[PDB]
């Protein structure tokens, strides 16, 4: 139904999902000069040493690398968060050209892509219950710029040929998401939403200030994926990003001065 085309893209989503015009929608532009340093924020705790990746799936709007979230194996804590949030999946949004692709922007700057590491609050028991709560999810957002290759991304890049089309999955065990993190964990944070339907307002966003670098060849392989299923007309999976939404009555806080 919904997608990223002229007739079903982000400007149409509100018809099926009226919360698209809600009070805490994502992504947003991060105006760095009006974000306020909050000295009471904590360092983020990203504990991914025991992460168990299982599978990679082309779901028709991105690809998800899925994790075993049936125990506390890969968790996000600290920063703005109360309690423990378990990693369930990561995915990316990217452009047709290097000058666009990110969902969040920084002083109106668009990056080539954006990584979303999705975590759910363990006090709600599972992901489906968590998305119904205002503090149900924590999404760690990381910008990608094109330059040097990211060695830790290459295992993802090289499996994409096997999940070219919508509905295809492949085994994807023993992938270490620590290889996708920048050096610094300095971040901005604000309350927002899922950036795809159902657009639920359940996310504490944590957006890292330092981008990671990926090579032109790596992002080119993202752009060979297909939105369509096998045996259907080829639509390249590109420009699968929602643009910035109104900030409304929200403040963005910075972990750093």
Ligand X SMILES: Oc1ccc2oc(=S)ccc2c1
Which residues are known binding-site members for substrate? Answer: 195-196
The residues that bridge with 92 in the sheet, in sequence order, are: 115
- Tell me: does residue 118 bind ligand X (CB under 6 A): yes
Question: Residue 146 or 207: which CB sits closer to ligand X?
Answer: 207
Question: Residue 195 or 245: which CB sits closer to ligand X?
Answer: 195
Say how far apart CA 105 and CA 84 lie, in whole Å.
27
Contact partner, 118, from ligand X, Zn ion, none, Cβ < 5-8 Å per class: ligand X
- Tell me: does residue 116 bind ligand X (CB under 6 A): yes
Question: Residue 146 or 194: which CB sits closer to ligand X?
Answer: 194
Answer whether 199's CB lies under 8 Å from 25's CB. Answer: yes
User: Among all residues, whose Cβ is closest to ligand X?
Assistant: 194
Question: Residue 90 or 172: which CB sits closer to ligand X?
Answer: 90
- Tell me: does residue 139 bind ligand X (CB under 6 A): yes
Using the rule CB under 6 A, which residue among 20, 81, 160, 194 binds ligand X? Answer: 194
**Does residue 119 carry a catalytic annotation?**
no
Which span (43-51, 153-161, 189-197, 229-237) binds ligand X, by CB under 6 A? 189-197
- Tell me: does residue 206 bind ligand X (CB under 6 A): no
Using the rule CB under 6 A, which residue among 25, 196, 204, 218 binds ligand X? Answer: 196
Q: Token pair 């929608």 is at which residue?
A: 25
Among the options 14, 33, 61, 104, which is catalytic? Answer: 61
- Tell me: does residue 64 bind ligand X (CB under 6 A): no
User: How do strand 75-78 and strand 44-47 relate by DSSP bridges?
Assistant: antiparallel
User: Among all residues, whose Cβ is closest to Zn ion?
Assistant: 116
Question: Residue 90 or 124: which CB sits closer to Zn ion?
Answer: 90
Instruction: Report the 10 Å Cβ neighbour count for 148.
Output: 10
Contact partner, 41, from Zn ion, ligand X, none, Cβ < 5-8 Å per class: none
- Tell me: does residue 105 bind ligand X (CB under 6 A): no
Q: Using H for helix, E for strand and C for coil, what is the string for the chain? A: CCCCCCCCCHHHHHHCCHHHHCCCCCCCEECCCCCEECCCCCCEEEECCCCCEEEEEECCCCEEEEECCCCCCCEEEECCCCCCEEEEEEEEEECCCCCCCCCCEECCECCCEEEEEEEEEHHHCCHHHHCCCCCCEEEEEEEEEECCCCHHHHHHHHHHHHHCCCCCEEECCCCCHHHHCCCCCCEEEEEECCCCCCCCCCEEEEEECCCEEECHHHHHHHCCCECCCCCCCCCECCCCCCCCCCCCCCCCEECCC
- Tell me: does residue 195 bind ligand X (CB under 6 A): yes
* Residue 195 beta carbon to Zn ion: minimum distance, rounded to whole angstroms: 5
Tell me which residues touch Zn ion (CB under 5 A): 116
Could you list the active site residues?
61
Residues that bind ligand X (CB under 6 A): 116, 118, 139, 194-196
């Amino acid at each position: 139904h919904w997608g990223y085309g002229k007739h079903n893209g982000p400007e149409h989503w509100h018809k099926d999902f009226p919360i698209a015009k809600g009070e805490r929608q994502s992504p947003v532009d991060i105006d760095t000069h009006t974000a306020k340093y909050d000295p009471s924020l904590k360092p983020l705790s990203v504990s991914y040493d025991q992460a168990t990746s299982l599978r990679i799936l082309n779901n028709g709007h991105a690809f998800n690398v899925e994790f075993d979230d049936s125990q506390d194996k890969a968790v996000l804590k600290g920063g703005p968060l109360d309690g423990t949030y378990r990693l369930i999946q990561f995915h990316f949004h990217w452009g047709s050209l290097d000058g666009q692709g990110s969902e969040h922007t920084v002083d109106k700057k668009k990056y080539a892509a954006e990584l979303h590491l999705v975590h759910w609050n363990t006090k709600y028991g599972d992901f489906g219950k968590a998305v119904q709560q205002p503090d149900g999810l924590a999404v760690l957002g990381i910008f990608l710029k094109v330059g040097s290759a990211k060695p830790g991304l290459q295992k993802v890049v090289d499996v994409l040929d096997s999940i070219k089309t919508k509905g295809k999955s492949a085994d994807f065990t023993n992938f270490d998401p620590r290889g996708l993190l920048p050096e610094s964990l300095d971040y901005w944070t604000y309350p927002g939403s899922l950036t795809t339907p159902p657009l639920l307002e359940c996310v504490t966003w944590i957006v890292l200030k330092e981008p990671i670098s990926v090579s032109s060849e790596q992002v080119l392989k993202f752009r060979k994926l297909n939105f369509n299923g096998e045996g259907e007309p080829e639509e390249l999976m590109v420009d699968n990003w929602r643009p910035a939404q109104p900030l409304k009555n929200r403040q963005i806080k910075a972990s750093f001065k």
